[PDB]
Symmetry: C2
Subunit: 287 residues, 2 copies
Amino acid sequence: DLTATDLARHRWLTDNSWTRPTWTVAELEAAKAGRTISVVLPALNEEETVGGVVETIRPLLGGLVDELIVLDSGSTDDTEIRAMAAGARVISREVALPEVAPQPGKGEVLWRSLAATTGDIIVFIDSDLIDPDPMFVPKLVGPLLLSEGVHLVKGFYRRPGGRVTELVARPLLAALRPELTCVLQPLGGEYAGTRELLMSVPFAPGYGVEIGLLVDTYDRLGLDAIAQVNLGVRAHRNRPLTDLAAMSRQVIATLFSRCGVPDSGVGLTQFDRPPMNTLRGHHHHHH
Amino acid sequence: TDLARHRWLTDNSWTRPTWTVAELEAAKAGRTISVVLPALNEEETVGGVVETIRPLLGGLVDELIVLDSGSTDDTEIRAMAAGARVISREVALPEVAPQPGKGEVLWRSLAATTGDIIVFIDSDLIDPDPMFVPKLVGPLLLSEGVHLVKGFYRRPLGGRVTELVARPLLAALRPELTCVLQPLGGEYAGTRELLMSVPFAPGYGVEIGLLVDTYDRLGLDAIAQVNLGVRAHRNRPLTDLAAMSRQVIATLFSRCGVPDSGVGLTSEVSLVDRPPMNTLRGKLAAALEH
């Protein structure tokens, strides 16, 4: 028979998941009701793709999107200048948050972007995407603008790969936070959140940032606050095993830190930042 | 940190074991060796595996058994024709109702064998080699203090579950054990002293459960590893790999006391071990304490 996890998943998909997120740009603009939207592309040495991503979002600038920022992590290729020519605002880690010395990794960049942006909604899109589609941002913000109670929207892709998601993230969530196995692509880099949520949670480092935000949101607000939207068909990216293993190790560390499991700190053997509201700027368990 | 891993590799890992069958027979010193092949519907490969071990029977190997888990194909008749004794789960441990999975089969085989050393070899191997059993027992017979030998394969110049799940989780929760190249491997040998005294994890958790329990109870130097030869990675469907991963997680969490929900993947997940076989077969166990 069905489990409690199964029952919650079914209703969560009915209410909080969209296979055909077909909202129009015009109706989303009309729903902003004074809220502003910032889009952030984290980038480190992505010169071949960053401009193409920027180009797909730029038409929304001045309408649905209020600012389009590439948060550069110290590139030595032409990432920054290509982002400039394509129509983005390039901001370094140091300019984003001068009072804290940087540390490496993607999570650092996204955390710092909270200090560099002003939008009431912040959208994150990876800068390494080969086939970005112009409707990514509209689809990601739809549930935030139209659906009461949603604070985090995860963009997923249909497939015409995924090993860390299916062997590491989903099985560990099944063990530790089984309701969250409803989220198809928990490690995805395309997602949007409210400023109120994002300023209030710690940010995990590196490859842990996405799953850390998902779990921290769940632990504070449950499934009701999380939604997902289909961004379209995309083939899996083929990363080398050493990168996948490093990803996995950090996904493990970040899940363990949120779920009461200690961790040796020992990285792979080969052969967090505090809430930004501590620096800038209810879901009761009792009755 | 790696000094410990370095010393263990130097003393407890063999990439090119030199041992001959004759040298190992001469080192048995009265110990007997049982070989157990778990099998469920492996008719295409089981005979080929048995055939590589059968020449040792009556010399290095004292018993050669296929522990059948309820096959409906020709696994049993083909295993027998190749020279193995085929034992069902029911015959192995008749008064205990069977439960599914590989851990059950290996556990039950302890009640159906007499060896001081038990060697497990998978029955789905496409390219078995006759020196597998010799290489697995070498450290047990010729070194001192070893109780568990893990057979690994050199890879052409472990799989996804090993490198993304097992090794990273061991790094987090039993960090010394990342020295073991292929912790999930199905070819391994153990002493009766060890195997009769530990619980057995269910299903796909059995290998990692045994590794962790051996490490905790007997220590790193009680574990060894040997290269069985070069073998390509087997290609399995992602759904099978994910189910394996989920059970590896459950078993490691059990061994650490991490609450696991028991919720599978939209897959079977058991958190319940079988107890040490010496609790159900105390007289057999005592007879083999030697």
